[PDB]
Amino acid sequence: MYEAIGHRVEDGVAEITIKLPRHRNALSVKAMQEVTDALNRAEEDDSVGAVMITGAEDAFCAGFYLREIPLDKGVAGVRDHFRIAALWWHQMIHKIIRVKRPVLAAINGVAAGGGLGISLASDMAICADSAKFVCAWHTIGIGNDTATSYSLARIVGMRRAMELMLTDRTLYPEEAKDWGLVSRVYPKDEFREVAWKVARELAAAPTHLQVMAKERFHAGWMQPVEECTEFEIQNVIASVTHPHFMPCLTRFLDGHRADRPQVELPAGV
Amino acid sequence: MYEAIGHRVEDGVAEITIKLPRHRNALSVKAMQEVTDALNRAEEDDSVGAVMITGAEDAFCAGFYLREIPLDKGVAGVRDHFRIAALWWHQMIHKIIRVKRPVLAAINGVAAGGGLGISLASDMAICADSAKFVCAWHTIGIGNDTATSYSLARIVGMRRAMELMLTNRTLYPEEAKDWGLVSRVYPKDEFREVAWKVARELAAAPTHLQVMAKERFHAGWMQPVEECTEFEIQNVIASVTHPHFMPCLTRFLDGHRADRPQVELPAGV
Amino acid sequence: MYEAIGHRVEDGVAEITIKLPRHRNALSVKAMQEVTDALNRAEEDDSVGAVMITGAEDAFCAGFYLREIPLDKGVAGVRDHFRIAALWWHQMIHKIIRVKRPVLAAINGVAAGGGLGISLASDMAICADSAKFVCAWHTIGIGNDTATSYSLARIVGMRRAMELMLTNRTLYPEEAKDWGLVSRVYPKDEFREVAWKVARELAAAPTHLQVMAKERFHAGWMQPVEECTEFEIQNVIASVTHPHFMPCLTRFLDGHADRPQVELPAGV
Amino acid sequence: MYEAIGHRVEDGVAEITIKLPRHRNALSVKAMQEVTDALNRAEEDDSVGAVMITGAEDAFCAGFYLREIPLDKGVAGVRDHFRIAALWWHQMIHKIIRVKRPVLAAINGVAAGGGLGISLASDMAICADSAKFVCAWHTIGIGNDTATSYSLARIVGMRRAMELMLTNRTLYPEEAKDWGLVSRVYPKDEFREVAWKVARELAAAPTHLQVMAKERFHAGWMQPVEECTEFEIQNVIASVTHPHFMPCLTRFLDGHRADRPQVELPAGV
Amino acid sequence: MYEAIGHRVEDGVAEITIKLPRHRNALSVKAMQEVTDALNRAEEDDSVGAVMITGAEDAFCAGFYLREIPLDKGVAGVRDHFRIAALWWHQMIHKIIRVKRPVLAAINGVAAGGGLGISLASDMAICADSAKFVCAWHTIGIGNDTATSYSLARIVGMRRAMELMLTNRTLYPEEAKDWGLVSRVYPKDEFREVAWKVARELAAAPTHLQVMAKERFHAGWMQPVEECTEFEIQNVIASVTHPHFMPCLTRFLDGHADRPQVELPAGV
Amino acid sequence: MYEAIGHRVEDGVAEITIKLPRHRNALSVKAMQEVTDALNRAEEDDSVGAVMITGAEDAFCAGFYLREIPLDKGVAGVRDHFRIAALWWHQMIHKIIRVKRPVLAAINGVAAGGGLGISLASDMAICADSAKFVCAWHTIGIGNDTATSYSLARIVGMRRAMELMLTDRTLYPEEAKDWGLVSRVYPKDEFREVAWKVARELAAAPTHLQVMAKERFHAGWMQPVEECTEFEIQNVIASVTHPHFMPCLTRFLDGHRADRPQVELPAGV
Ligand SMILES: [Ca+2]
Ligand SMILES: [Ca+2]
Ligand SMILES: [Ca+2]
Ligand SMILES: [Ca+2]
Ligand SMILES: [Ca+2]
Ligand SMILES: [Ca+2]
User: Fold this and answer.
1) Are residues C106 and C194 in the same domain?
2) E94 an active-site residue?
3) What CATH number is attached to the domain comprising F227?
4) Ligand 6 centroid to residue F50 C-alpha, Å
5) Is A193 in the same domain as A88?
6) Residue D148 CA: distances (Å) to CA of B92, D120, D122, D156, D220
7) Residue A36 is part of which domain span?
8) How distant is the Cα of C253 from the closest Cα of chain A, in angstroms?
9) Residues in chain C preceding a C-to-N separation beyond 2.5 angstroms (breaks)
């Protein structure tokens, strides 16, 4: 089906692969449209319980596909293009945050500009020890976007966000982990496999509860406590009404205990 | 007086103990009502300078009291119980956050679900080396609440908040501290004493200024700088008019440094 | 010339020096007013690309100049002083956050009360290994201000913000860095020079782009994603329309983006 | 079933009647709890399409039930009663606003204090020509509540809201209508019938779309346009997937105009 | 040239005409896209000082072009169409509110669903005595959109907004004016001309100042007073620094401010 | 005392008179400072129960004092001036909205630019039949300020606000009243007297309750209902604790009834 990205649905995971390895996996306008499409479809698929965004080969995503920028048609040309890709970049970004599925960013290589935006917009993020993160905007002479003014500070605090953007420094895995930018780091050679198992475990876990958590996290950052608890309680009520409930309860009371977390992230490095 | 909680007021500290050790200090509907009452009372007691919440024995609070959920009244019976419990759990959580007293969560053991919510709603938190934290909602099949959509990310950032909720893994003291969930960790055997001493200091410190700081912190998170300052200024003017001020100014002019601590947190482990 | 602060403009950097060394660089009402003026001027100056705030000597800023407080006019005299002082302090704190230039806080030493406030309001912050931070408000007996109810938790999260204020604990460099309060720590001896290098770089960096990011960061903290992106897009369009654009592109294209704009030495 | 309110469900309408005529329909703590319960029940009744709140006889609701305030227990007794009553008054007010059903306030007489709060929290309001509205808080010496700080200005603008609260004057039907406080006024003798008919229409109209509109209105007041649209879009997509849609599209394509009313409000006086 | 809409640029006014008269000026996906483009262009054109949105003939805009809905692809086909359509409709609604030009909505006739949305999103609105407004959403069976959850209550208050949507009542000009939905009402016959005059004036009015006000109004609705004033101040400074300033001053000073910028005939 | 404005405290009212009649009462930088001062003092004066802002003679306030603008010193000069007056204009505006006293704007003549800002910032507004309102900004070539982007729409709705600013039209009393911009209009010859009596009645009414209402109105416009009710309840509790309370209650129960509103605004014209 898709012609600009890799995609598959297997074992409950809708896996989207950014695919333009020769150009570091930068995202073309058509690919972005496909990514948005695939997210829409994932959310509409009862068989899908989670989404995985990863890059082909050794790069995650190098951001804007600079080579699509028309040089043959003046300022207007350049602008008209940006308007177009900007639209798509954002439709895509918003979707990752709004989609009714947990989204895992398996950062397998470099993430720059929009690629970093992607990793920040996702719900969970893990990376290879060979990965790296860089804003890149300030270097190419373009204003920051891809929701970086939303997501970054929400994850690393205002100061670190500011620093990264202003210095255009490259953030390595250890530091990214420390920052909370990634949860775990895994050896390059084992990454794919690790990431694929995490994805499947996220898919297998109860989507309903996951979505409740995800939407409340985004909403609650900006709301007062009493407003947060009202939407939280609505979820509670809905959740105890759902068929998934009683069985969990009975199992607890019966003496069953889980020998492992819902989603296991191995220690990594 | 209270029949489902432990309570005592000494040395300027109103100490609330979650008490149902046989059931890991899970919080009953009756108990939650008593905690709120106790919180209201503390705020009205001139002799109380701080509140401390802790658990009996070796557990902090196991969250929802699952054993009081009706099982012989259908989904309706279930739904009904949760509506009630939910009202009281949130009236309590909100009270911890709005109470005109600094609240120290002395986490002496496991804190799960609503127990973790309590920990996160408090103003300060310290724990024993044997304590542990877990979301647990998902495992039991319930949507998350107890203000986790408000408090968690405000403390650990959105990424870590999402992670903990989604994986449902157990967070241990060292990591909790690293995340900002607890300020310090103490050996189990020294914990109680250490905590009482911290509570006393908090109690002895200037309540009026504490309340100003507490309210401003909650409010300011969501306000633009110019509005925050207006409210801060109103507090400044009120504080320099309060009788507490002059004498401090005097001491300072007389060589006593303002870097003197109000509360001494021992290093711990 | 200013009378209450130090002020240098070099290599596109307008350096503001808090200067009242005998009294730990506490900020007097006059000084505050000059800081704000210096801010406005910097932004007005096409030559200036960055602003650096630092203290004279070995101290950053001890906060409110308590020795300015009138004691011969009763409570009302106290109150009146604080009203004027509060006005100026906040006009200045606001400026730092709103000014159309990147602001580097070079914390050469102790930062207390309003001095910490200054530290938190700045866009970037680095300190000398001999620096320290303390709230002070709770001991001096004054309600917290200088936008601490805005900036502290934004930088260190709610729990740490609350702790710091309530305990009146002093924060040393290692912890400050860990907390995100400062990006790097440097040896007292190498400090000023490191700081100047950084500042120079920031200055050279593309100002327009820096402002976009700055403004966006402050605004976005409180906005839903779809509103954030509308503002980011506007910036994007404006930027690709600006002269600075093509050459960067062309260059990238040509062979010449992961290149650091501002090098921040690892320090200690 | 209920002992302090009148209640009935007919023709798709759950009708809640504030009933304490001898005391001008002031709302007792017991009564308020019943109203909330009734609201919860309506939202869960497939056969209820709308809720109508009105008063017995010739008064709508005189607000706080002043005669149940303890007088032989000091300020404490007073304070205690108000904390309780306050919890229940707000649980009810919030429920009117959050309930997943359109709520019509059929103001058949005076609405004072909390009575006016009820009127303002409802989704739609109409009144008899003999109705009247008054803040009353100040006269009785109490700070205003019942969400007047939320609802009043959202309906009449800040100036008129301030004015009414500060002057404490009685607003009559014509002015109320002019202010937007009521949509229409009807002769006392025709009121009840007119209101039941309006309620039935509201009940018969598409609840799902009503709820979408209601929630969006409350939320959107405080949200920027791009966020509002995202949520509106999610509703659009859900509504065109709902079975209700196709048949309407069909009718329209078959010449039936979308200007057909869902609810017919008679001119009144 | 556009293919789905009418588009005139005269006397600094870029006039956008919704044009699908056979179908009551419903907006097709193509058309939407052109409206947005026309918006961008207007803002890009130093010659254009205002934008006017109106409908062809006797109708303003009947909303969603329901005849574009695919019926041969099942539910999914429906859904897919609406996803694309929703995208375009909102990109356009947003533009109207965000565009850096004043936007006048000249409601020459019926405005339903998205057409009302358009009406609400515009900066100013006037209608012909033959116009009318109706939500339509609740009868057509579609959840409300086109920013109605944003703009309606902002204009008419929560109670009236809710009523209108829930009853699906049609609003005639007298009421619309009373409600604040339109500023003036004019005879069908004099309409277009009145509208053009107004538009021309808006166009001539100082654009920079108009944008400042527009942006501020949208932003301020949700901000505390001290943040509002910071943004208003910035605008003030920018404006007194702009060429346009002095002459106005000088003039005032000289003898030549209560003079109407845009005359709005009393109409009926 | 003051040298640039008229001022007096009498019968519980702190009356501030803008005084520069030759220049239509435009506000000079020094006067603005005095106004702010007088507001500060009013709030600190136990004898003051309300504030009245009015203009001298036949003009209310013509706004910025254009004649203070330096022409002898280039762009910089003009800018430096604006920076200064802007600061004061806003300190003043904010104060009217934040001051712990009800503020009545007795608009006795023309209100332009900042003068209109003043009338919008006040808590209650009434005018003479000879008064008029005009933005004026767009005409003098200056961006709108004085909190017009806060206050106007809050009072008249977004459309009317936009219109007024964009057209720079002059709004007459009848229309201003209709808009909710003023509550009442009185004949020029009786205005002063009417306004003076309203002021005294606002002063005589319970300041504590007035402030509660005022602050909650400004805050609540932007807050969700559950957050609004929490601050509302805090006021309730405080109010029933206050000595003013019991007496009101007892009087009610005893059979006393007020023969008039707290603050009587006569019908006017
Ligand atoms: Ca899943
Ligand atoms: Ca204390
Ligand atoms: Ca620069
Ligand atoms: Ca219905
Ligand atoms: Ca123009
Ligand atoms: Ca008073």
Assistant:
1) yes
2) no
3) 1.10.12.10
4) 5
5) yes
6) 24, 8, 12, 11, 19
7) 1-204
8) 8
9) 256
